[PDB]
Amino acid sequence: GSVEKLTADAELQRLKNERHEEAELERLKSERHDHDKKEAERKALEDKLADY
């Protein structure tokens, strides 16, 4: 989500996944703001084992 409430760090890793940035970003624009939190974990398990 462009809002970037407290997930600015997640937006960073979202740019990190340039191989999938346009997909996650575009979705979050239309999809609920709460969905940003889920996509934070989605790419965590996607890019790496996990981001904890």
UniProtKB/Swiss-Prot annotation:
A- repeats lie at residues 9-21, 22-34. PAM has more than one binding site for plasminogen; it is thought that each of the a-repeats can bind one plasminogen molecule. Belongs to the M protein family. It comes from Streptococcus pyogenes. The chain holds residues 85 to 133 of 388 of the full protein. This is Plasminogen-binding group A streptococcal M-like protein PAM. It is found in: Secreted, Cell wall. Residues 13-51 have a biased composition (Basic and acidic residues). Residues 9-34 are annotated as: 2 X approximate tandem repeats, type a. The gene is pam. It comes from the Bacteria. Residues 3-31 are annotated as: Able to bind plasminogen. Binds to human plasminogen (and plasmin) via its kringle repeats. Also binds to albumin, immunoglobulin G and fibrinogen. Could provide the bacteria with a mechanism for invasion, as streptococcal-bound plasmin could permit tissue penetration.
